[PDB]
Amino acid sequence: KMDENEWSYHGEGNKSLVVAHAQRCVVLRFLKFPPNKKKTSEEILQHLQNIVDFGKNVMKDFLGENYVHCGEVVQLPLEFVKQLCLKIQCERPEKDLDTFSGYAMCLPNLTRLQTFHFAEHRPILCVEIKPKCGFIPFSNDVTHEMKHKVCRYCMHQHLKVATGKWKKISKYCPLDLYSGNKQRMHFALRSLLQETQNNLRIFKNGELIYGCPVADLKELAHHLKPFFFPSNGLASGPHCTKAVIRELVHVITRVLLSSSEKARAGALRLGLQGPRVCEASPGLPKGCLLYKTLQVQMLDQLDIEGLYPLYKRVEQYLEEFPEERKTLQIDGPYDEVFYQKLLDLSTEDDGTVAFALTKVQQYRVAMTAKDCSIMIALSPCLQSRLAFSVSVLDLDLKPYESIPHQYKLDSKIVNYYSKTV
Ligand SMILES: O=P(O)(O)O[C@@H]1[C@@H](OP(=O)(O)O)[C@H](OP(=O)(O)O)[C@H](O)[C@H](OP(=O)(O)O)[C@H]1OP(=O)(O)O
Ligand SMILES: Nc1ncnc2c1ncn2[C@@H]1O[C@H](COP(=O)(O)OP(=O)(O)OP(=O)(O)O)[C@@H](O)[C@H]1O
Ligand SMILES: [Mg+2]
Ligand SMILES: [Mg+2]
Ligand SMILES: [Zn+2]
Ligand SMILES: [Zn+2]
């Protein structure tokens, strides 16, 4: 028996909606789809099963077993889904919700959990960061001038601000964060606090308390003092907002730079081609999650510019041989062989379709890693004496048909930014 009153609205990115249970530390993830065309009921089941099979097989090998969690696909009563949707409709921010299938993913609620223990903890603080792409493209295939010296995030800011999506430009550059420089990382996190956008959220015990009275720097610092300056009897005591936010920013930097005891044979060893600094504003440990995420982003070896020629070869082949879309395993299954196909890092274009297809798939995987989120969970545990857990969220492979749009959008981002100067 599923009561609709127990589940609350948790969040919503443009492709899926999440709801969280108040009692158990789990969440349910429902898909969004366009009116043209809404997917069939048995196709939804396979889509969700591919998201699990991608995270299970591909991303656990690239990032680590401890850092990825992708719970099972589950079936629910339609009457529960209809009623839960209507309640939650109210709380949406404003692509139609999956109301007719009754299929969803049951994931653990990482806002209330530690990974290494894996029970609920309280009091528990959680910082969810969306870091974006951590390098500037370096291939000779790129035409435009600005792309070699400014990262896509900073270039995308200006368009988003002018569009009206955001009010002001952020001072956050991903390359400050991904560079192992503590000083740059600290600055990157402070700017990201000052202008959150969709790139930062903070929770206390499951409840959102920061990045969408908005509100608010002082009010945040109230919730953080018990974690960072714990009064063990004595309240000594008077800590200003500046000092509280500082201890947050240090701890998050210290956490992202931490790695497990393991420093295993790197799945990816791709070197960092500069610029390591960005013209928008002023190494990283091999074991840590932030580095491993950067490496899977670097499967975009040739830029989008770039890869669109390689995409065109695979499309003219499937124009003429449409039956081979399935036989080539373009839409999975994302199994142990599929992970092996991604490890060919060679960049010569003599082999023509076998090579292009391999690179198209590597690019789909990179686009996933650029758009992924990182969750950090601070809390006391028996196994300040704060214990941490790192995790990655939002790991669903970007669809094959979005590659045209990715070219089209990047062309618009740089041309507006170059016109602006
Ligand atoms: O359009 P882009 O390249 O800026 O990236 C999209 C994001 O834009 P933003 O973070 O606002 O700059 C976009 O963010 P918002 O929906 O605007 O929060 C999504 O993360 C989207 O991912 P998905 O394809 O829905 O999984 C992202 O789409 P993909 O490009 O990853 O397909
Ligand atoms: N396992 C989880 N634990 C805690 N919070 C979660 C979990 N899964 C999802 N969320 C929250 O739900 C939000 C929205 O879900 P999600 O990002 O997965 O959907 P999306 O449409 O694919 O997003 P995006 O547009 O960023 O690609 C996330 O930003 C995250 O804060
Ligand atoms: Mg998505
Ligand atoms: Mg997300
Ligand atoms: Zn930048
Ligand atoms: Zn514990």
Numbering used by the authors: 5 to 98, 103 to 220, 226 to 295, 312 to 412, 427 to 464
Copy text verbatim from the article accompanying this structure deposition.
Inositol 1,3,4,5,6-pentakisphosphate 2-kinase (IP5 2-K)3 is a key enzyme of higher inositol phosphate (inositide, IP) metabolism. IP5 2-K is present in yeast to mammals and catalyzes the synthesis of phytic acid (inositol hexakisphosphate or IP6) from IP5 and ATP. Mouse IP5 2-K folds in two lobes, N- and C-terminal lobes, connected by a hinge, thereby conserving the general fold scheme of PKs and IPKs, and in a similar way, both lobes coordinate the nucleotide between them. The CIP lobe represents more than half of the protein and is specific to IP5 2-K enzymes.
In addition, we present two different crystal forms, including one or two molecules in the asymmetric unit, respectively, the first showing much better resolution (2.4 versus 3.2 Å). mIP5 2-K presents two zinc ions in its structure, one in the CIP-lobe (Zn1) and the other close to the hinge region (Zn2). In fact, Zn1 is present in all the crystals obtained, whereas Zn2 was only detected in the low resolution ΔC-mIP5 2-K crystals in which the two molecules in the asymmetric unit interact through the hinge region probably fixing a conformation captured by crystallography. Regarding Zn2, it is created by two residues from the hinge (His-125 and His-129) and one residue from the C-lobe (Cys-410). Mutation of residues His-129 and Cys-410 to serine produces samples with a moderate decrease in enzymatic activity revealing that Zn2 is not critical for protein function. Therefore, Zn1 is key in all mammal IP5 2-K enzymes, whereas Zn2 could be an artifact of crystallization. Unexpectedly, the formation of the ternary complex (mIP5 2-K + IP5 + ATP) was achieved by protein incubation with IP6 and ADP.
